[PDB]
Ligand binder design. Structure first.
Ligand code: CLA
Ligand code: CLA
Ligand code: CLA
Ligand code: CLA
Ligand code: CLA
Ligand code: CLA
Ligand code: CLA
Ligand code: CLA
Ligand code: LMG
Ligand code: XAT
Lengths: 213, 210, 215, 230
């Protein structure tokens, strides 16, 4: 009675409709156990979060290119900011790994113990790192607008919208890499190449996607 | 945790700063004085750092005030960070040894009254002179109060002492940080901030030094 | 109980009343080294003495190091003070190490025998009246007696405070000595020289600008 | 049965006409939390009051000094009191007032009394609405003025972004942009200056330099969202 990724086939038993963005897509039965599924919900969420941030990053910095601004492409922005700004690179990598190892191990021991990370062991914060549910921490820091409390039905709507935009941002970030490994130029240059001629500047005329050209 | 004066009027206060200690306003955001056995030591330490800082500010400003006005001292116009190099009737090692013996007497006399109050109020050699009983540590009284004060309105006097002392501790930290950056006399820093108050803030001296 | 990781299951042999009442217990034994209670009793002694010798050594490195870079001492580097001070020395190093191992082994074997059986050295007739102050306290690792001249143990309040201050300053000094060795190997300079090199350019002069974080 | 932002609509359940200016407009659900709606009401009032003072300032500054331009007015003012002395006095004098207002927000029955003139105390007012000495000779109904303030304030919040996005596209103050729109209405709109078709995007050119000199160290002036413009 609910929509499924493949109409006709029933959804599997471990996958009733309670998660955000559930459509019964597990042909390989990877999340059959409830705890491995509890871990993969967290994984799909945070991959979607980083992919939404990344896709907005590529799209904004490619609107910055081709209009006339001095922005590079996304595959060139790694070099140009460690060379234009005198940034030593392995220390930037180690500072990234320090800050995000902190922020990640906090989450990694919230998964192992949901009521933890909230006993004031950190700098005096008790309810702010409480965690509302799996992959949805909330509180005063992770929800400063406070949209996780109020109308709960609209919060379930926002949960499903987050998962939807996160899925197609993961697909977009998988597609930017393929647009770059195939064509070799910017993504919004590939869009304007597909728009200047809708035929013949698609993937089937790139010489790489189909080898039977 | 009462109607006491507060450093931030409106916020909560942790409650162990009710008003029994002189001149408290609840300012302990790091929550250092949770154990009261640390808080008694911190009260005596604030009194001692405050009284030595009040002597420090009175001994840095007043020689520089009478140097910029101008008297005829053997040491006049010398910096407080340069008075150690100035020579005297004795070299500074003998000065330091006499200091570290006289204060070795006085500080242990004070500490024995810290660890047992009322138990150091008798002289060693003249066992007829005494301080009057009923004194608290940090405030001996007796010959240390020769002008007959503290015989009424003692809480306001302790609050005046701790406020002038906290101000003078900030002033001596100012003397350090304000003689280490610009390298001048702390009264000749007031002279420049009164010469043109807008064209020398700390930010413009920082940015000119950067 | 203020653990080293807030979300971890603390090992159950660090949650016993014998081990929770121990100095500096933050629940840290991820490799199970103290699962036997007498193994933990031995390693508590090993931690106290590895940390007290490290506090003495790291003080003897960076107190004359900071008093060398600020003047009014000329103490050399800690990795150079064996090359020098053997010329300004009444003895060569071999005889000095032999006298060292005798004077230190006489101490360390008495400590060995007191760890294997507490109050051993307090039995009468051992020394010439000196053995009476050698029972230590009721717990091992903290003898007192002649080793508490200022008398900070006669309190029974704030005593766990002094324990935990000793253990935390000692763990920090053990990390500082492992530092001193490693920051000598990595760049060949001194520790206060490395501190000045970090403080003059933090975002370019660190352990990501040498060959030891190599990809 | 109050008037709404869209007349046929139903207002959300957290917007029940209690607050002034409550016309049922919160489509993103941001005023659902009761604790967060107080902070949002305070920030709407403060954004609105700063925007009204700013719009009146830019308009009066243009009608009394047509020579100088308000986007450039922080660059050519040439005060005798230095560049950083102004910022230091503003920093301390605003860090006082803002922490006072913030502590009013956190505990409303805490901060009323003048700390150095203790006989003077502010009456037990409403959060966001101090009154007493900030408000002498209030005319007429206080709820009617409380609605008029939010209406003129929302209009001025839109007007300040109008001033900024005029002055970054035409580079002229908001009477000279109005004189452009009155001298030639059909060709001085934003749809006249710009259009994006699927195949090319004609953005308007900048009228703000990428930097200004200003006494040695140069300040970058980001033309807001250039490139993302139509
Ligand atoms: C995990 C995501 C990710 C991906 C897909 C890439 C992908 C790429 N990076 Mg990149 N990078 C990443 C994370 C990532 N990087 C991180 C976390 C850092 C640390 C700040 C860098 C720092 C970096 C630099 C400094 C450079 C690249 C470069 C490149 C390109 C290789 C040529 C390629 C497009 C290079 C580039 O721009 O292409 C020449 C380059 O010089 N990257
Ligand atoms: C050596 C200086 C010294 C010492 C021992 C103290 C000690 C104390 N102060 Mg005090 N204070 C000082 C300097 C000092 N103060 C100065 C300079 C100011 C002016 C800014 C104040 C202003 C002040 C207020 C307004 C109040 C106190 C209070 C207190 C008491 C409780 C807070 C506490 O545990 O702090 C313990 C303090 C220390 C352990 C010293 C830490 C040294 C720091 C880390 C150095 C670096 C500081 C740096 C600028 C940041 C305690 C007796 C409260 C009180 O009276 O309650 C009884 C109170 O309301 N103090
Ligand atoms: C606390 C404190 C400390 C540590 C110092 C330390 C110092 N002061 Mg000083 N001073 C202080 C408070 C303090 N002052 C106060 C509160 C005032 C007021 C002064 C007024 C003052 C003057 C006017 C001078 C010093 C000088 C000196 C220096 C030499 C002291 C000397 O000549 O022996 C003093 C020897 C004595 C025997 C006096 C002790 C007996 C007195 C009279 C009991 C009362 C020395 C750095 C001198 C200096 O720096 O010139 C180079 C100097 O000329 N002080
Ligand atoms: C309140 C304690 C205090 C403080 C803050 C200072 C601070 C200072 N002393 Mg000093 N000194 C002190 C007590 C103090 N001293 C005592 C108790 C004695 C023994 C009487 C000396 C004897 C002394 C000498 C002999 C010299 C200093 C010097 C100095 C200055 C540089 C030394 C340094 O790195 O520090 C510095 C401003 C030196 C100086 O003025 O040259 C810059 C210097 O030559 N001091
Ligand atoms: C008793 C407090 C006190 C006072 C009155 C002064 C006064 C002064 N300082 Mg100073 N300073 C202080 C503490 C103080 N300082 C402390 C604790 C430090 C260490 C961080 C410094 C570090 C410092 C530097 C590095 C410099 C100054 C400078 C100055 C002068 C110009 C003012 C300025 O640029 O703002 C400086 C203001 C501060 C650094 C903040 C001080 C914070 C205080 C404690 C709070 C305010 C106290 C109180 C509410 C009001 C004071 C007035 C009252 C006592 C009569 C001026 C004469 C500059 C100078 O010499 O140029 C002429 C300069 O370059 N100060
Ligand atoms: C513990 C310990 C550690 C970590 C070191 C470490 C070191 N010693 Mg050393 N040393 C120790 C105990 C220790 N020593 C003892 C107990 C003695 C007394 C016999 C010496 C006598 C000694 C000499 C005589 C020399 C060293 C030297 C050295 C350095 C060369 C390797 C190195 C930093 C050498 C050095 O510093 O030359 C560069 C050197 O010549 N050591
Ligand atoms: C910061 C370090 C530190 C701290 C907090 C302590 C704390 C303690 N030690 Mg310990 N100890 C240390 C370092 C330390 N020790 C080192 C490095 C050694 C090896 C030399 C020892 C050797 C030692 C023995 C053999 C004994 C203790 C004892 C004690 C206890 C009571 C004495 C006391 O309160 O000392 C006060 C702590 C201080 C830190 C005082 C300040 C002294 C300064 C740091 C000197 C600076 C030296 C430097 C060269 C200049 C208490 C648990 C006794 C005990 O437990 O009795 C039952 C006992 O028998 N300790
Ligand atoms: C037209 C917009 C407008 C309106 C209707 C109100 C209305 C109100 N305000 Mg409000 N306010 C405004 C703008 C406005 N304000 C702005 C821009 C600020 C920031 C300066 C404030 C700051 C403010 C505070 C801090 C307080 C109020 C309060 C009040 C209430 C009672 C005061 C009163 O009678 O005001 C009636 C207002 C008018 C009749 C408007 C007259 C406008 C004249 C014609 C001058 C406008 C042009 C002028 C040249 C601008 C420059 C002046 C100034 C910016 C230097 C009432 C709800 C008080 C309150 O809530 O009490 C409970 C209170 O404490 N307001
Ligand atoms: C010097 C550098 C050291 C700084 C140390 C910082 C950490 C100090 C620390 O322990 O925290 C100090 C305390 C630690 O927490 C304290 O712990 C104590 C025992 O551990 C008691 O339990 C106290 O009740 C508890 O407050 O932190 C706080 O409590 C800070 C609370 C601030 C609340 C602000 C709310 C903000 C909301 C406003 C938003 C609108
Ligand atoms: C003693 C010590 C150093 C003492 C230094 C001395 C005396 C130095 C003396 C000198 O410098 C001077 C004075 C002057 C110089 O001229 C001469 C020398 C001679 C050079 C360092 C100890 C240094 C000791 C260190 C660093 C120990 C680190 C151990 C760790 C981190 C283990 C952790 C774990 O074991 C647990 C806790 C639980 C398990 O489950 C998990 C794991 C992780 C296995």
């Amino acid at each position: 009675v609910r929509p499924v990724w493949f109409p006709g086939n029933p959804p599997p038993a471990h996958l009733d409709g309670s998660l955000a963005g559930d459509y019964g897509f597990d042909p390989l039965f990877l999340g059959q156990e409830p705890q491995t599924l509890k871990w993969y919900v967290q994984a799909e969420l945070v991959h979607g979060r980083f992919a939404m941030l990344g896709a907005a990053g590529i799209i904004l910095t490619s609107i910055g290119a081709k209009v006339g601004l001095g922005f590079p492409e996304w595959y060139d922005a790694g070099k140009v900011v460690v060379e234009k700004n005198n940034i030593d690179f392995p220390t930037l990598m180690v500072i990234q790994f320090y800050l995000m190892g902190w922020a990640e191990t906090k989450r990694w021991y919230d998964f192992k113990n949901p009521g933890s990370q909230a006993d004031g062991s950190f700098l005096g914060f008790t309810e702010e790192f409480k965690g509302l549910e799996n992959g949805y921490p909330g509180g005063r820091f992770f929800d400063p607008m406070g949209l996780s409390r109020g109308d709960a039905a609209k919060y379930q709507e926002y949960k499903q919208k987050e998962v939807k935009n996160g899925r197609l941002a993961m697909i977009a970030c998988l597609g930017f890499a393929a647009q770059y490994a195939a064509t070799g130029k910017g993504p919004l240059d590939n869009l304007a190449d597909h728009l200047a001629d809708p035929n013949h500047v698609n993937f089937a005329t790139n010489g790489v996607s189909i080898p039977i050209a | 945790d009462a109607a006491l004066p507060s450093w931030m009027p409106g916020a909560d206060l942790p409650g162990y700063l009710n008003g029994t200690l002189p001149g408290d306003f609840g300012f302990d955001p790091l929550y250092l004085g949770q154990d009261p056995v640390k808080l008694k030591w911190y009260a005596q330490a604030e009194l001692m750092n405050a009284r030595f800082a009040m002597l420090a500010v009175a001994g840095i400003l007043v020689p520089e005030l009478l140097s910029n006005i101008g008297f005829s001292w053997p040491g006049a116009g010398v910096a407080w960070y340069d008075a150690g190099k100035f020579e005297y009737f004795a070299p500074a090692s003998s000065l330091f040894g006499v200091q570290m013996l006289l204060f070795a007497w006085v500080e242990i006399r004070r500490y024995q009254d810290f660890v047992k109050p009322g138990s150091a109020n008798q002289d060693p050699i003249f066992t007829n002179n005494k301080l009057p009983d009923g004194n608290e540590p940090g405030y001996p009284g007796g010959i240390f109060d020769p002008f007959g004060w503290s015989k009424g309105d003692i809480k306001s006097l302790k609050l005046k002492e701790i406020k002038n002392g906290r101000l003078a501790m900030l002033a001596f930290a100012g003397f350090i940080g304000q003689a280490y950056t610009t390298g001048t006399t702390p009264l000749k820093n007031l002279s420049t901030h009164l010469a043109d108050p807008w064209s020398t803030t700390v930010w413009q001296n920082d940015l000119a030094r950067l | 109980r203020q653990s080293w990781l807030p979300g971890s299951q603390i090992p159950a042999h660090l949650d016993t009343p014998a081990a929770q009442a121990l100095a500096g217990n933050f629940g840290f034994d991820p490799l199970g080294l103290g699962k036997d209670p007498v193994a933990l009793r031995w390693y508590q002694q090993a931690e106290l003495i590895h940390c007290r010798t490290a506090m003495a050594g790291v003080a003897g490195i960076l107190i004359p190091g900071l008093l060398t870079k600020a003047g009014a001492l000329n103490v050399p580097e800690w990795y150079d003070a064996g090359k020098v001070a053997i010329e300004n020395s009444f003895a060569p190093w071999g005889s000095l190490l032999a006298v060292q191992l005798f004077l230190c082994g006489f101490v360390e074997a008495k400590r060995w025998q007191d760890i294997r059986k507490p109050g051993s050295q307090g039995e009468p007739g051992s020394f010439l009246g000196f053995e009476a102050s050698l029972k230590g306290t009721s717990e091992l690792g903290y003898p007192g007696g002649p080793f508490d001249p200022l008398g900070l143990s006669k309190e029974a309040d704030k005593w766990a405070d002094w324990k935990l201050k000793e253990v935390k300053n000692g763990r920090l000094a053990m990390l500082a000595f492992l530092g001193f060795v490693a920051q000598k190997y990595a760049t060949g300079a001194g520790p206060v020289d490395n501190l000045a090199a970090h403080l003059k350019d933090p975002w370019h002069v660190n352990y990501a600008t040498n060959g030891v974080s190599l990809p | 049965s109050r008037p709404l932002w869209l007349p046929g609509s139903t207002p959300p359940a957290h917007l029940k006409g209690d607050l002034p200016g409550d016309f049922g407009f919160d489509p993103l659900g941001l005023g659902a939390n009761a604790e967060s709606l107080k902070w949002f009401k305070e920030s709407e009032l403060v954004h609105s009051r700063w925007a009204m003072a700013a719009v009146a300032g830019i308009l009066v500054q243009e009608i009394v000094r047509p020579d100088v331009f308000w986007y450039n007015a922080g660059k050519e003012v040439e005060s005798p009191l230095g560049p950083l002395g102004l910022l230091a006095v503003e920093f301390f004098l605003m860090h006082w007032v803002e922490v006072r207002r913030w502590q009013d927000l956190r505990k409303p029955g805490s901060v009323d009394q003048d700390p150095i003139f203790s006989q003077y105390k502010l009456p037990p007012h409403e959060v966001g609405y101090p009154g007493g000495v900030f408000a002498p000779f209030i005319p007429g109904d206080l709820a009617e003025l409380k609605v008029k303030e939010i209406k003129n304030g929302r209009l001025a919040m839109l007007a300040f972004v109008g001033f900024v996005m005029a002055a970054q596209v035409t580079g002229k103050g908001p009477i000279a942009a109005l004189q452009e729109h009155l001298a030639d209405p059909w060709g001085t709109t934003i749809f006249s200056k710009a259009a994006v078709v699927p195949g090319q995007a004609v953005a308007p050119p900048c009228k703000i330099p990428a930097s200004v000199s200003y006494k040695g160290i140069e300040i970058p002036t980001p033309c807001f969202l250039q490139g993302l413009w139509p």
